[PDB]
């Protein structure tokens, strides 16, 4: 951590203390991938396949219409960030299928 300047205003303001490095709390591990969860999600994806909107986005990405895919994914899911993450995941699925075939 950067040492504070000792002033009331400006960049890095505030009273100077000796900041410590904390061992990370186990409640902050949420979101990390684990081997069992990765394995189970991969098997369930193989068993269950895709949603119809996911098939539509995959077809748009295969046709190369990336702006169409992002707009349709935003309409289907709700938010721009979720649409972007879904488009990246489906592009990874398409790339894996292409490298398999």
């Amino acid at each position: 951590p950067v040492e504070r300047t000792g002033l009331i205003r400006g960049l890095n303001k505030g009273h100077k203390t000796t900041r410590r490095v904390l061992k990370e709390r186990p409640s902050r591990r949420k979101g990390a991938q684990s081997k069992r969860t990765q394995f189970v999600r991969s098997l369930i994806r193989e068993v269950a396949g895709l949603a119809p909107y996911e098939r539509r986005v995959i077809e748009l990405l295969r046709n190369g219409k990336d702006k169409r895919a992002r707009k349709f994914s935003k309409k289907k899911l709700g938010t721009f960030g979720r649409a972007k993450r879904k488009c990246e995941e489906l592009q990874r699925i398409i790339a894996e299928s292409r490298r398999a075939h």
Partner: protein
């Protein structure tokens, strides 16, 4: 074990296998009675994470409720007061259909306690729920410290007072700035804010 796989598969509700199972089970539950007893949970992982155990004293009841909005039972569907700029087709019930289902199952089995409930199916007319109930008079329940809190008389009809999960959601019992009006109880908070307090040495 298998319940991790069941949770991951229950996430994929638009897949072919889950859609087929939902279709056939929706037909079967529509053929059955509006409230009826289920021999075992149809979603065992969901029931287990909501608190069901395969123990003498836990029962599962399935219930369907008519979905949509709420109608005010005025004659001819029209009010005789000041104009409202809306129709009775657009009134909204402040509790959930899940809560209505839990109330009706509790009235069907008034000797039991409603623990929780979960969605299982829906169509255009109905939403379908499964309610977990506990027998407070069964001694297998009464000897178990994880569950025998429900045998106390303060937990009579939690679904009627909004003490289940859907009731807590509807009452808005969460911490922070978005739930200022409701987190301690809305009417209680209103009474506290509208009480005139007069001290002796004022």
């Amino acid at each position: 074990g298998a319940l991790k796989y069941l949770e991951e598969l229950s996430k994929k509700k638009q897949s072919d296998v889950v859609r087929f199972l939902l279709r056939v089970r929706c037909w079967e539950y529509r053929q059955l009675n509006v409230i009826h007893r289920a021999s075992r949970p149809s979603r065992p992982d969901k029931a287990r994470r909501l608190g069901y155990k395969a123990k003498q004293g836990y029962v599962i009841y399935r219930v369907r409720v008519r979905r949509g909005g709420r109608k005010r039972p005025v004659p001819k569907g029209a009010t005789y007061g000041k104009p409202t700029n809306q129709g009775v087709n657009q009134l909204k019930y402040q509790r959930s259909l899940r809560a209505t289902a839990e109330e009706r199952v509790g009235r069907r089995c008034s000797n039991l306690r409603v623990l929780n409930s979960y969605w299982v199916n829906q169509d255009s007319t109905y939403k379908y729920y499964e309610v977990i109930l506990v027998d407070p008079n069964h001694k297998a329940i009464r000897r178990d410290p994880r569950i025998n809190w429900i045998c106390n008389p303060v937990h009579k009809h939690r679904e009627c007072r909004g003490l289940t999960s859907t009731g807590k959601k509807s009452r808005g019992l969460n911490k922070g700035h978005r739930f200022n009006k409701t987190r301690a109880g809305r009417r209680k908070t209103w009474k506290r804010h509208n009480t005139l307090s007069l001290w002796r040495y004022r």
